[PDB]
Design a protein around this nucleic acid. Sequence first.
RNA 1: CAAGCCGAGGAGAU
RNA 2: AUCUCCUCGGCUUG
RNA 3: CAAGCCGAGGAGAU
RNA 4: AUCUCCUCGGCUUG
Lengths: 675, 675
Amino acid sequence: ELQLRPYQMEVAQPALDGKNIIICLPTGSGKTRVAVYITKDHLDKKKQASESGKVIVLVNKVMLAEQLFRKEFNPYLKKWYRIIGLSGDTQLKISFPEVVKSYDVIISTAQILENSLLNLESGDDDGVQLSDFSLIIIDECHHTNKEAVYNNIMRRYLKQKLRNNDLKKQNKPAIPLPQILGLTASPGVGAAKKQSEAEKHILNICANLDAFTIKTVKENLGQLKHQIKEPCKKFVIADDTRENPFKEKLLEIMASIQTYCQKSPMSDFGTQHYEQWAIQMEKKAAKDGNRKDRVCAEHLRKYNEALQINDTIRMIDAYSHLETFYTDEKEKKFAVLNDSDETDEFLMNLFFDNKKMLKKLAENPKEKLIKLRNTILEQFTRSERGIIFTKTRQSTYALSQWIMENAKFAEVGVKAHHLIGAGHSSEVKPMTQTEQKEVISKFRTGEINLLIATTVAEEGLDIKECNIVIRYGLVTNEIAMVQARGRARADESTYVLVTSSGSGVTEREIVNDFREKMMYKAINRVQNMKPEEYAHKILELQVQSILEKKMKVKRSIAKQYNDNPSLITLLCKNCSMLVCSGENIHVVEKMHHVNMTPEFKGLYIVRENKTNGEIICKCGQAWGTMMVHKGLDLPCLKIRNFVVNFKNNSPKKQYKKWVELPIRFPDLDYSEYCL
Amino acid sequence: ELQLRPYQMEVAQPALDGKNIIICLPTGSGKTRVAVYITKDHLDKKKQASESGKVIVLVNKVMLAEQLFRKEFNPYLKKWYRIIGLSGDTQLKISFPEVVKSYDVIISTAQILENSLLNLESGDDDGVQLSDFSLIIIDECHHTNKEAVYNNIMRRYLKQKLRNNDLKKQNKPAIPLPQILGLTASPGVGAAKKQSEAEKHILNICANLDAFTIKTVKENLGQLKHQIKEPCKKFVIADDTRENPFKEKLLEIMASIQTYCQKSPMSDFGTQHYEQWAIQMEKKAAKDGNRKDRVCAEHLRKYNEALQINDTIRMIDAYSHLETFYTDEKEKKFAVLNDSDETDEFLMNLFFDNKKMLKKLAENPKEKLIKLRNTILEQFTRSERGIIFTKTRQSTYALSQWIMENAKFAEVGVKAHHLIGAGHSSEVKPMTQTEQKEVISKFRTGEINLLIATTVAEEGLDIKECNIVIRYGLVTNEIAMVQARGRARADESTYVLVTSSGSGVTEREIVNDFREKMMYKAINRVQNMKPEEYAHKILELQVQSILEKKMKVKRSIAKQYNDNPSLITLLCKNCSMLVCSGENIHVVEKMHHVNMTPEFKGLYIVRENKTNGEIICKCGQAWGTMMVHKGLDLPCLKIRNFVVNFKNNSPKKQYKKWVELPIRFPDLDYSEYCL
RNA sequence: CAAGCCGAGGAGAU
RNA sequence: AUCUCCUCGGCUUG
RNA sequence: CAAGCCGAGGAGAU
RNA sequence: AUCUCCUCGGCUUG
Ligand SMILES: Nc1ncnc2c1ncn2[C@@H]1O[C@H](COP(=O)(O)OP(=O)(O)OP(=O)(O)O)[C@@H](O)[C@H]1O
Ligand SMILES: Nc1ncnc2c1ncn2[C@@H]1O[C@H](COP(=O)(O)OP(=O)(O)OP(=O)(O)O)[C@@H](O)[C@H]1O
Ligand SMILES: [Zn+2]
Ligand SMILES: [Zn+2]
């Protein structure tokens, strides 16, 4: 039943017989079907060869593993051989080492295999070796980078390959090495200005992947051009001339607070440099133990980010963010007072006094939003799907709120939903993988006609067809832009970019376009190179990478060696008071820290407002949570909100992290808490 | 919205229609607005001409490019056309060749364009040609000199122009050449005594720029005289009669050390000739391999420079400099001994024994500083900005320390800060471009009322208004003086010069004044000349310059031809011992050198005190650093601290430089370091 | 469904 | 090399 | 933020 | 033509 096409033959013909190589075709070129066909051919050759045929497929994203399991690999290969799809979300509840030798076909994230090999080296588990495999297939090869996961696996493979070469000169016996295949569309450039450097980056990629070729289509390219239609390019610009009243009022309060705290701005307002200066002032205040330097800095930061989003988000969202922050602060203050400095009262009373007028001033008119609405609605009328790319998740939420609230979209009847990434990213609600999964399914079937997504959807997150692809103030790198452009896969596509004229964004878009042109100019060059000098370059890059990794591991071992028991005193950053000693702390689960002595309980204050409570200091500085672990409600504390004081010279140092502290703490002896 | 003035029309009228010319107006005459208006007119003519309009602007300084991008060009031209500002600091991260044909307006440093053209000639990159442009504009035309960057570009242009002329006689087709405009205020004189030679220099400038005219204002000159007010000239002199005690003690130790090392001074003390003699003795000691000749010479040099600054700097700074130098020497000696000649002990013990008495003798009183303070404070009281020009950066630092420490300035409340140049200049901390940028911004907005700067601020570094301009022992050339004088741009200005009466400095100031007078006397002359003989002179100078450049390139190619693999033996200059062979050395990044054999590791000693360590010899002579490159911590060595010994005739030669050695070294073969 | 931990990648400013 | 901002994967607990 | 490399310009003395 | 002292730009590495 398997079906194929000419360009697929031409690209995949070399790999049919050895030739561990890479393949670079645009999106929607059937690369997945190429891969399944190649795997089938390899397994057939093994069977007719009376040799063990093992195939492993590696994908950076978890979803794509199940996607290939459901759509391409299993349907076209179910009957001939045994197949399985692994992932972190999925329970590989047997084990990796033997399922490698139980199904002959593995589809798993690279991290699982990497963990298995590390376990083997540690000797804790029997583990697995690459020799057990006969064919490795890697999707999204462009991620093979300085020390990415793919790069780690390939560095192990290349060390084995160098050992085998050395033996070939020394001893005939050698460890067999499985074939390697790579799939990609935009290999990318490591920020190379000279085309020579771009080719150097391409050769580095090839050496990491041991491809020895690229094998891009050259004969039937016309057929691909006919089948694939590139979206029409559209540029959109804007200027922030309006917004004068409320911006002016906010800047007036800005200047007032600054002069009150006498902060030299050392930079222009509304920029990342100012935030960095604010953080430097935070650190200085920590090293000095004074107030009036950090609360003001955080408030300035909140105002700055509010202003930044205002240029790209409606003022209502910024006002709500600020109000929520101040309400949380006031709840903190009320709790601390309930248990029972002038600048804090100044800030809160300033905001309270001007709260009503600020609300009235923000509610009034005086935007990219109006023109975005114009473009989207006129396009929808002309069409009778849609994707938005932005910077931060709350921007996606604001866009969803805007499209729901406005009645014009309801008149059009366009369906929309907000999609974002997972995990915790500094005050953005983590999103569950399953939730993203039903969102993508709902969009796939048709109910959602508009999908708002962050960089996650830029890569992978494959869809059959997306008619409209519009980016909104998001330009990062050539790979992101090109993959977003190719994600349309529609017969007729509209690629739009929206941003501010003052900001350097259109320049970035054209830079990515030139990077694509340069990628072609370099890929065609490398495809035409002398085999001897070529292989020489691959060897040089391989050996250099292996050596660099070896020195890096040596310096990682040599960097962390102190591990002293107790040589410090931990204080509260906000109020320089002795909070804990260097030994009273105890470790649990080899990851968390806690203080158990009741003397510590007599210092801090417990607070809960909302299923684990949080801790606060006498000065209102948040410390941690009340972890419920194996019965015990242990008070876990975050070093992110503390200060250190060594026993000698008292050099104050803030780490925002535990491992960055070279000295280790003792584990929790439950026997110390008997009765 | 664009606005203009009559003299601007009169000067710029000829350029409106061809007439590749130059313009010479004083500072703050709106030359920038003249340039933007001319560019706008040219682009409009191209548009109505249905022809491609390309404009490129060249500036020697990096900052001025962004300055024109922010203040003059973009604000007045944003809407009509597309604009961009390039620089080394800025990432032209697309490429030069196509951004030339992407925005129609380029503002970049000349070096970038020069590099692009050299790349084109080499054929490595597609590159760019001047034909792609339609109008070239050059600021600071006075820098078009013997083989400056502007001169290189103009020499290429003039070779093309001569080819086009030859074809015009031979073949009608010819490569079109963009118009050329030059902007300046003080074209300058190439040290001409006869007014005929001054006019010759002016004609050389014009020929390099192909100006064919000067077009200085002659009609509305009265209006410029009214609008611009020249600063009042002030001379100040001083004598070093005082300072007898500590100077006498220093000269006593001077004589003691000299007699101990029996050095014929061959010159007077406290002069550059003595330093040159000391360096000659250094070289002789290198050619003989003896001690007691270089350490003493360096100590004498340090004493000499200390004395020189004492005439213009407080003794505390000189004492601190000497103490730091000797502490560094002693740390070196302690390290070398830690691993485990009588004159060195003599020097160190002499300084140690007299250290306390020297400190006590320097602390006592017995200066230009007191009168400088008097003048500055009385002027500040009279005024109810300020700029200081000096020789060396540490002088600026000393001035900042003096103004901060003294309480009288605090009573006045004058704000001050030290500004200096960037880069490494033999034991002066390099300064970052961004740092200079925020310094200039802070002064511009008002917080800094006093800006101490070196020759960098003399040229460019434009400021709206600088009330006070005072120079402190700095007279170099007529251009520096005139530009510093015009940099005031204040309605009322005070130009002051301070220096020693004995030194020949007031003479230099009046020489620069006469040079300005002579520049006018020659510019008015050249503006009135016969067109035929004029063009003849321009042609003669152009052809002469092109021919000279051609012979220079021929002799540069013919000079470096040996490039032998290994014919020498490298020894330590201080101790004549075999340090390395002619082949054991290896090259990396095509710029650095290193020795990898452990036998070399068994010879030198590693030292680190402070993120790269340094190397020292068994005799305490510093050699290089431990470069951390692409993983490897390769030991990089500086030929500046070594001696050479050829395999024949053993002629010792010190180069202070690698390229000056005609023989080349092999690159680093990483394969030689496997495992 | 929530919390925590470990590593990695990309962009922007020093 | 440092700081900031975003994103991915793996592990643990409830 | 630090280090290194390449060229160029100016001043002073032989 | 040589030596010394200052300044500019470009490139690379971390
Ligand atoms: N040989 C083929 N004949 C017909 N259609 C094909 C063939 N190969 C692939 N396709 C089309 O490919 C579409 C799926 O594209 P697919 O996901 O395989 O592309 P891709 O290049 O792997 O994508 P991406 O770059 O997003 O990972 C299917 O709708 C099918 O129509
Ligand atoms: N046509 C004009 N009308 C009014 N003011 C003008 C005009 N042209 C220039 N100016 C004044 O010029 C000042 C800026 O001077 P500018 O930097 O252009 O001088 P410049 O001659 O280029 O300087 P420099 O010699 O330092 O490079 C502005 O403050 C503006 O007041
Ligand atoms: Zn506290
Ligand atoms: Zn030595």
